């Protein structure tokens with residue numbers, strides 16, 4: 001399974017945008033999984049912090065010139081990586097900053 005019982009609950013509290021109304025749902029995970037297949041990426045990688053980090057490494061070079069679809073996929077996986085990593089986040093913006101802040105020492 002992509003998310004554990006505890007994970008889904010954290011998942012459901014995270015906002016798509018800072019202070020936004022919309023929050024993450026199972027359908028974003030289902031969409032991200034189909035999307036990965038469309039990008040020739042193994043959707044099983046969604047299941048772990050390490051697999052999600054590998055996917056973001058694969059997608060990031062294309063993120064600067066990316067379409068909304070690619071940017072949305074990337075944002076959803078970053079959030080999932082945080083959830084798998086047990087990094088608390090309130091929204092997608094926070095998730096992206098915390099990942100940026102781990103790497104960037």
Ligand SMILES: COc1ccc(C(=O)Nc2ccc(Oc3ccc(N(C(=O)[C@H]4CC[C@H](C)CC4)C(C)C)c(C(=O)O)c3)cc2)cc1
Nearest residue numbers: 016017018022027028031068069071072073075076092093
């Ligand atoms: C101020 O900082 C920020 C500003 C903006 C954002 C932000 O936009 N975050 C942000 C935007 C999109 C994100 O992920 C998705 C992926 C698929 C979606 N779906 C779609 O149908 C979309 C598929 C792609 C297509 C191109 C549009 C429809 C369905 C699964 C519901 C949706 C959605 O519409 O809820 C959202 C995650 C974060 C985050 C931070």
